[PDB]
Structure formats: structure tokens, C-alpha cells
mmCIF file of C-alpha atoms in Angstrom:
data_model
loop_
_atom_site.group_PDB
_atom_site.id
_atom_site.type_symbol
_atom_site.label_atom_id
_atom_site.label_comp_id
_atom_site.label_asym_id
_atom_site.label_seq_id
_atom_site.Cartn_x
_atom_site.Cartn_y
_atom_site.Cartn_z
ATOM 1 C CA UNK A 1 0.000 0.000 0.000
ATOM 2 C CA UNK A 2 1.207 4.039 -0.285
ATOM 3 C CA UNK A 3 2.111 3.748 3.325
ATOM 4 C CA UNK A 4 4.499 0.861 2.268
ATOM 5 C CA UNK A 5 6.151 2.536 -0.315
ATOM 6 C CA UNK A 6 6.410 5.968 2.059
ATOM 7 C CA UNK A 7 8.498 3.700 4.459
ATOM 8 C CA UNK A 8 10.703 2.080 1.372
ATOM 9 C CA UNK A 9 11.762 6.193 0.462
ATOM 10 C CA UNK A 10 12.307 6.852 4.213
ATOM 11 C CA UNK A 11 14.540 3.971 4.568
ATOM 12 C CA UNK A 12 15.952 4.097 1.486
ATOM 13 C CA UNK A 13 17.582 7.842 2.235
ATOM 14 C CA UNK A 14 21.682 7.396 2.499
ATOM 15 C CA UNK A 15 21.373 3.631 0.543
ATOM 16 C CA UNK A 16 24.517 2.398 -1.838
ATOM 17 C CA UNK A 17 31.671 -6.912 -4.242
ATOM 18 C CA UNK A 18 33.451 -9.558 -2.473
ATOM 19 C CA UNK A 19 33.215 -7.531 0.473
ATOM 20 C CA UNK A 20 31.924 -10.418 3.598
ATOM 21 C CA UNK A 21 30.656 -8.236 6.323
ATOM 22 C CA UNK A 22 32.196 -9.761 10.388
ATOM 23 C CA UNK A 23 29.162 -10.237 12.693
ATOM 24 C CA UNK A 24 29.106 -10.866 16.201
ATOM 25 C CA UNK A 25 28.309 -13.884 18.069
ATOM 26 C CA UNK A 26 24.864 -12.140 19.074
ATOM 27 C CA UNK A 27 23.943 -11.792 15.727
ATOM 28 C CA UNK A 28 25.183 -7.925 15.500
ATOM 29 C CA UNK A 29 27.657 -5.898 12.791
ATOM 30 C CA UNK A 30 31.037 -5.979 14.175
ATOM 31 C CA UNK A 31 31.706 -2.051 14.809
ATOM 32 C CA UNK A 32 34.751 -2.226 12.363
ATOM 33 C CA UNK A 33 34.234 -3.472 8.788
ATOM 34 C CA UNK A 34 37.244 -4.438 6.800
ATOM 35 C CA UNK A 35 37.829 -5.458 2.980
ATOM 36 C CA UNK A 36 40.637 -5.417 0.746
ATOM 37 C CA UNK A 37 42.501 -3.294 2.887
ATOM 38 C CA UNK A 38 40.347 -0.470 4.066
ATOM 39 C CA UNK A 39 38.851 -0.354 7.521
ATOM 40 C CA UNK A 40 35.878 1.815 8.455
ATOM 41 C CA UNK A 41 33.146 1.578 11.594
ATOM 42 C CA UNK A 42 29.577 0.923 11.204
ATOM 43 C CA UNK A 43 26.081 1.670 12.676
ATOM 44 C CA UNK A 44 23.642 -0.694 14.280
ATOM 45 C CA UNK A 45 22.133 -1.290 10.515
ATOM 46 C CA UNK A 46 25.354 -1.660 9.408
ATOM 47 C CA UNK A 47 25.889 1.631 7.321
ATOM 48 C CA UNK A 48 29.480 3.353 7.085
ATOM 49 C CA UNK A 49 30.153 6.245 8.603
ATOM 50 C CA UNK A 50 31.350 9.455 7.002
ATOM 51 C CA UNK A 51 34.926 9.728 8.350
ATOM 52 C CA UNK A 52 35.496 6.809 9.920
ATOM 53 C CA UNK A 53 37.274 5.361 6.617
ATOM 54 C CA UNK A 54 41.083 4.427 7.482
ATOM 55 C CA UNK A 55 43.763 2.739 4.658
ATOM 56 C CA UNK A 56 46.083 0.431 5.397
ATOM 57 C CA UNK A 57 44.725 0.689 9.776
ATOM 58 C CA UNK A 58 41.935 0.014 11.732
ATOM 59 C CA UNK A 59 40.023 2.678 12.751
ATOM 60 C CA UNK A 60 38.999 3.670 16.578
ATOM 61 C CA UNK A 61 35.204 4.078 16.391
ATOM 62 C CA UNK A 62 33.488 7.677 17.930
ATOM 63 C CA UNK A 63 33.102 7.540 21.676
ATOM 64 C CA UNK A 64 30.713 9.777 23.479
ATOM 65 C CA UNK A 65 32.413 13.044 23.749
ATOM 66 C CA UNK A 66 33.201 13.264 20.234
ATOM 67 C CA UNK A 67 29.450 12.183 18.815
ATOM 68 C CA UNK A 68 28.267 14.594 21.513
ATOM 69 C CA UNK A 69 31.069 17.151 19.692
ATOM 70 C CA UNK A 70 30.082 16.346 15.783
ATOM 71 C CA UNK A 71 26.427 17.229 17.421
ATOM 72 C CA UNK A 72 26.500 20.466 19.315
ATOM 73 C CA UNK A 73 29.129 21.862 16.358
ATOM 74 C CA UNK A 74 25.656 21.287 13.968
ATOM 75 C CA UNK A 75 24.034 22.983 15.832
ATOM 76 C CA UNK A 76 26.398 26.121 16.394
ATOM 77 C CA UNK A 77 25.679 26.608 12.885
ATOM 78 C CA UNK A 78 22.320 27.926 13.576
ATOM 79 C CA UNK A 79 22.953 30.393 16.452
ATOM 80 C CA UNK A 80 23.086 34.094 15.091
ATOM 81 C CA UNK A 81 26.595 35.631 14.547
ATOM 82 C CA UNK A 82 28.547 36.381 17.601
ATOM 83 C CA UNK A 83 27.017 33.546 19.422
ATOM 84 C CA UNK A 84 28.157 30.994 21.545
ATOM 85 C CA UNK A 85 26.667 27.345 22.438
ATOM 86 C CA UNK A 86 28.371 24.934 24.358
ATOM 87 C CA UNK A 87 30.362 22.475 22.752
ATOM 88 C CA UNK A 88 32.663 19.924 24.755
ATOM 89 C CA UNK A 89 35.915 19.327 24.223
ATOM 90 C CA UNK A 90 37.926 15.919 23.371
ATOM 91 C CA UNK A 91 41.443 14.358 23.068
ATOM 92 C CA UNK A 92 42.539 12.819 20.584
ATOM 93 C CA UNK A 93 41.970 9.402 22.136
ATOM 94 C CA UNK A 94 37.979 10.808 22.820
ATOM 95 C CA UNK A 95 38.428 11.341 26.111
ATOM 96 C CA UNK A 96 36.639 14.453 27.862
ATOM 97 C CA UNK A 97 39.128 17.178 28.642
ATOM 98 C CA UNK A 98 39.514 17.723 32.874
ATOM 99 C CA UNK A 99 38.056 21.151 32.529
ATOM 100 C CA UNK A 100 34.858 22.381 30.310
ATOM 101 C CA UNK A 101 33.765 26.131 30.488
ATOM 102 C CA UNK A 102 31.024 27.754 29.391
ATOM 103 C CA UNK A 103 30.163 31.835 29.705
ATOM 104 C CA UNK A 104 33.014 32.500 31.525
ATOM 105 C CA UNK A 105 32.358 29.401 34.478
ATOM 106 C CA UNK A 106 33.993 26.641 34.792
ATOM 107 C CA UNK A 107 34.081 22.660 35.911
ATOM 108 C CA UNK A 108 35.819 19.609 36.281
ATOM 109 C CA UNK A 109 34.145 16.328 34.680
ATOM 110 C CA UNK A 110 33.908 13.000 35.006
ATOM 111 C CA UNK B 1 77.454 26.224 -6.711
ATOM 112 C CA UNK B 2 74.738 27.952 -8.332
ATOM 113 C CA UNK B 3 73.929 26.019 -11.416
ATOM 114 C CA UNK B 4 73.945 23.123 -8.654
ATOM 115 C CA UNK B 5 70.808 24.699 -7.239
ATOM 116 C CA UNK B 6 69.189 25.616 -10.251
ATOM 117 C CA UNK B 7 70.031 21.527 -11.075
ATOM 118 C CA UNK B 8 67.729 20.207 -7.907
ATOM 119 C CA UNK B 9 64.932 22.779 -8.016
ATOM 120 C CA UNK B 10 64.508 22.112 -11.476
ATOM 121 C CA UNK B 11 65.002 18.018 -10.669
ATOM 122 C CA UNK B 12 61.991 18.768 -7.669
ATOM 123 C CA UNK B 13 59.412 19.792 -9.405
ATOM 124 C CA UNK B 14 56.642 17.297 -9.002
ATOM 125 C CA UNK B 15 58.313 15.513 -5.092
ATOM 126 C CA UNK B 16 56.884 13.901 -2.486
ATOM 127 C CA UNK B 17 55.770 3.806 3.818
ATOM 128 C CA UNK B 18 57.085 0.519 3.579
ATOM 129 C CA UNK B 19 56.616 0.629 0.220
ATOM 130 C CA UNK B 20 59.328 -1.395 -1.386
ATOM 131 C CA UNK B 21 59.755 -0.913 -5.243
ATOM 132 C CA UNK B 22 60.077 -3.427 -7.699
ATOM 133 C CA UNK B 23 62.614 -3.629 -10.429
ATOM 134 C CA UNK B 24 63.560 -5.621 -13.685
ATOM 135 C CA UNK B 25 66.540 -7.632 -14.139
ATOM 136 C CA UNK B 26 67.729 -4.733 -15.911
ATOM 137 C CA UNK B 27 67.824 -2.557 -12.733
ATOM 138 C CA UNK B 28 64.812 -0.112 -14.228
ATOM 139 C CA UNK B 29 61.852 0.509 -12.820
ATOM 140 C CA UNK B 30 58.739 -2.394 -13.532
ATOM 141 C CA UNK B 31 56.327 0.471 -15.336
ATOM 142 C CA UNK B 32 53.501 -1.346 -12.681
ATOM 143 C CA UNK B 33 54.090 -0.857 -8.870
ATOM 144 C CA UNK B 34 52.128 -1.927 -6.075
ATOM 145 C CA UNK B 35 51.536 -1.118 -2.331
ATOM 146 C CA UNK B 36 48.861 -1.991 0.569
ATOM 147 C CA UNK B 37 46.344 -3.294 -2.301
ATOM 148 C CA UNK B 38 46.720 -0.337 -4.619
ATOM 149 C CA UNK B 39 49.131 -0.444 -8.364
ATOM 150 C CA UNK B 40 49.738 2.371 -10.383
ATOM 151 C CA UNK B 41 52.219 3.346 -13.260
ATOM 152 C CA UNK B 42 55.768 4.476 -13.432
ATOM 153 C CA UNK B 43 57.664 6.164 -15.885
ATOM 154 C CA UNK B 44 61.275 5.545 -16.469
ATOM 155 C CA UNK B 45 62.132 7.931 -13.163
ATOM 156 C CA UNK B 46 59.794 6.068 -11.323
ATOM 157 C CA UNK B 47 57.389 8.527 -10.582
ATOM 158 C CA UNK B 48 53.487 8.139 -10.579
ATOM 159 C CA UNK B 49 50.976 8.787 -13.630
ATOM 160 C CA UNK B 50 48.207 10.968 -12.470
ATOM 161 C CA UNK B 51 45.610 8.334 -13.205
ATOM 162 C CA UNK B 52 47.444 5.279 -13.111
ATOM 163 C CA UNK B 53 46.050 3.997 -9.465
ATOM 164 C CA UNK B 54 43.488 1.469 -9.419
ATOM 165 C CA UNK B 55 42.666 0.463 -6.198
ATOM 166 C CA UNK B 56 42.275 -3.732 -5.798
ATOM 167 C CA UNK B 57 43.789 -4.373 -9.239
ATOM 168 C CA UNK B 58 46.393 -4.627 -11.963
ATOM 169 C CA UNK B 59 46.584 -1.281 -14.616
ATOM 170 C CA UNK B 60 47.004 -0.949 -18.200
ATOM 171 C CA UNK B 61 49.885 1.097 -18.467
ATOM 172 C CA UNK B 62 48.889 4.193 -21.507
ATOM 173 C CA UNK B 63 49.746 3.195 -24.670
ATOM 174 C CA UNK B 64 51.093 5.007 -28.136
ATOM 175 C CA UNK B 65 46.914 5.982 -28.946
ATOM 176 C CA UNK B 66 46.249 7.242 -25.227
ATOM 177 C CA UNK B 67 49.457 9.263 -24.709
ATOM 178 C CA UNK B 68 48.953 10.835 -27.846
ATOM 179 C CA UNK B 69 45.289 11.465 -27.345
ATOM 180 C CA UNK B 70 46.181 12.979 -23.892
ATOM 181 C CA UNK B 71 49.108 15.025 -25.627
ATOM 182 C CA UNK B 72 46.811 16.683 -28.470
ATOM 183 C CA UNK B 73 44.218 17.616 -26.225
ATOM 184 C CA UNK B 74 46.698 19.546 -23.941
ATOM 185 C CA UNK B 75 47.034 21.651 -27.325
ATOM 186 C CA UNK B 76 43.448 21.720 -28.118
ATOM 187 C CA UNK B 77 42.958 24.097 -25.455
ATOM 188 C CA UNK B 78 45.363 26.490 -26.284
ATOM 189 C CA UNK B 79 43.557 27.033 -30.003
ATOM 190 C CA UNK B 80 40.946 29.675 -30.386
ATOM 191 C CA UNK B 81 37.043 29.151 -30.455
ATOM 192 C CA UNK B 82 35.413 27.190 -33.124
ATOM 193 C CA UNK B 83 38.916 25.921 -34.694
ATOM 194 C CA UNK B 84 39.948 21.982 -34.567
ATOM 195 C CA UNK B 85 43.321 20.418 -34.548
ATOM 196 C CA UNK B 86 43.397 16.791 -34.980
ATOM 197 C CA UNK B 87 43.332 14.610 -32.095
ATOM 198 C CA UNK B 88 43.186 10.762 -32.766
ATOM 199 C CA UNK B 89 40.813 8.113 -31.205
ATOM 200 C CA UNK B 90 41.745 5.233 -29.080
ATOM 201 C CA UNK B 91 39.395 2.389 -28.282
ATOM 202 C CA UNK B 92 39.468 1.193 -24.467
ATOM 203 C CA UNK B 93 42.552 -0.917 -24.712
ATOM 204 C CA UNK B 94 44.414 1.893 -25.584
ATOM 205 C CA UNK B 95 44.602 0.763 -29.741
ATOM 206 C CA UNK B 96 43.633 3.508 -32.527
ATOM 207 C CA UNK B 97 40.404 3.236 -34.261
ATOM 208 C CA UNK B 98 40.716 1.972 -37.988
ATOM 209 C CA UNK B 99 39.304 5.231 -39.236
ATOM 210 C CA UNK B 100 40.962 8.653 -38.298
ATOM 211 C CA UNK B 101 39.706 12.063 -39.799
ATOM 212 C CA UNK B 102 40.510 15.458 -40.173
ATOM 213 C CA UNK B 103 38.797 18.636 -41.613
ATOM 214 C CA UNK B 104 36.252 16.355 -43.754
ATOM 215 C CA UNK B 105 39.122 13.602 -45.231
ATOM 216 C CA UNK B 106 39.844 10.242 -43.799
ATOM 217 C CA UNK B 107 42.197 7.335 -43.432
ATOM 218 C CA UNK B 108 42.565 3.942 -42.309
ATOM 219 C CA UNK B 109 45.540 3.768 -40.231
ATOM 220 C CA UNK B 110 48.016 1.119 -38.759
#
């Protein structure tokens, strides 16, 4: 029926040999997808993610600071000009920085 | 001195891991070389054709058609509006097409 094909579209959006995808023993994508010598991290469904492509490596997968990062940085590009919305900061390992500040106060995080 | 210098900046023009070349019983250069799944093409200096790499696979180095082809249409764009200079036609594996033409006359070729 129409409502069918309405959910085919939405599923469809962001939709693309040899390549044998590694599952888990639960039944799940493995996080890191490999073939013919590129390495790149995957979704729940199993979809690559934009950066995460590595030659030649094995990529480490985004960890909570920086998805929470990539998230709040899209949305500082709708606050007016001469705005500021929080945005944490990461290592490059991921890790939260010690101190995060925000209108002129600051904290230490977990 | 000098002339030494103008020597290697003229000799760096167009410079750049584990990569280990391979050579011909000759000691020059094998024209296809290969690294962490990718192969590209080499001229006599060893240095990379601009679309040589092929990523999982073997290339066809150019042949006499293609680097001709590729030579008269660096020229092409140096005539004026609405003029032609001849520029012959290659089939995909690089060989010339029977037929070649040129302001309303035509030849088979070799």
C-alpha cells in the first residue's frame, strides 16, 4: 500500500563486491568493517560512517564526547553571529578534557 | 654552486611507507608498482601517472593511442574558439580506431 512505499523512500535515504561483512556472536555488525585493505566503523544497521574510513589501519570508532562534539558543532551553525553554544571538548583518544567552560564558568568532569 | 641549485629545483618539481619498489633484471623501474592493495604506473624515473592507481587491481599502463590522445588535447585548449586540430581516437585498450579524420578527409591507419 502508499504507506508501504512511504516507508521504502524513508529507509531508502543514504542507501549504496566480495566484500563479507564480520558479525558478532549475538547476531550484530562488528563495529569495524574491513575489505581489501580499508577499515571503516559501522552503525547498528550496518551503514558506514562518514569519516570513519582508514587505509592500510583500523580505525577507533566515535566515543561519546566526540558524537556529543560532531552534534553540538551542527548545531552552532544555527545560532546568530557572535554567538556561543556549548560544545565539549575531546582528546585525541575521545576522552573528555579535565576542565569544560562555558560563559566564563567553569568545571571539572567525570 | 649555483647552477647546482638551479640543477635540484629544477630536478623537484613534481616531489613527495614501507613501500618497497620493484625492479627488472635490468635494474629499471617495472612500469607497474604496487603497495597496501593499490598499483599504479611508473615512468622511467619512477614517478606516478596521475591516473594510473586502481585500487584492488592490476593497470594498463597508456599506450602510443592514449598518450597521444592525452598530448593533443593539452594543445586543443590552447587554439581559439570554433577551430579543430586533430586529435586521434583510441578504443578502451588503448589501440587507434581503424578510421581517423581530419577537416572532412579520412584514413585507415596502422
Amino acid at each position: 500500500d502508499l504507506g508501504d512505499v512511504m516507508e521504502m523512500v524513508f529507509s531508502s535515504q543514504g542507501c549504496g563486491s566480495l566484500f563479507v561483512p564480520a558479525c558478532t556472536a549475538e547476531g550484530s555488525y562488528e563495529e569495524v568493517q574491513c575489505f581489501a585493505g580499508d577499515c571503516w566503523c559501522v552503525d547498528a544497521q550496518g551503514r558506514e560512517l562518514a569519516g570513519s574510513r582508514v587505509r592500510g589501519g583500523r580505525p577507533r570508532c566515535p566515543t561519546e564526547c566526540e558524537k556529543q562534539r560532531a552534534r553540538m558543532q551542527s548545531l552552532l551553525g544555527s545560532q546568530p553571529a557572535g554567538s556561543s553554544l556549548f560544545v565539549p571538548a575531546c582528546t585525541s583518544k575521545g576522552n573528555f578534557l579535565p576542565v569544560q567552560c562555558f560563559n566564563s564558568e567553569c568545571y571539572c568532569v567525570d
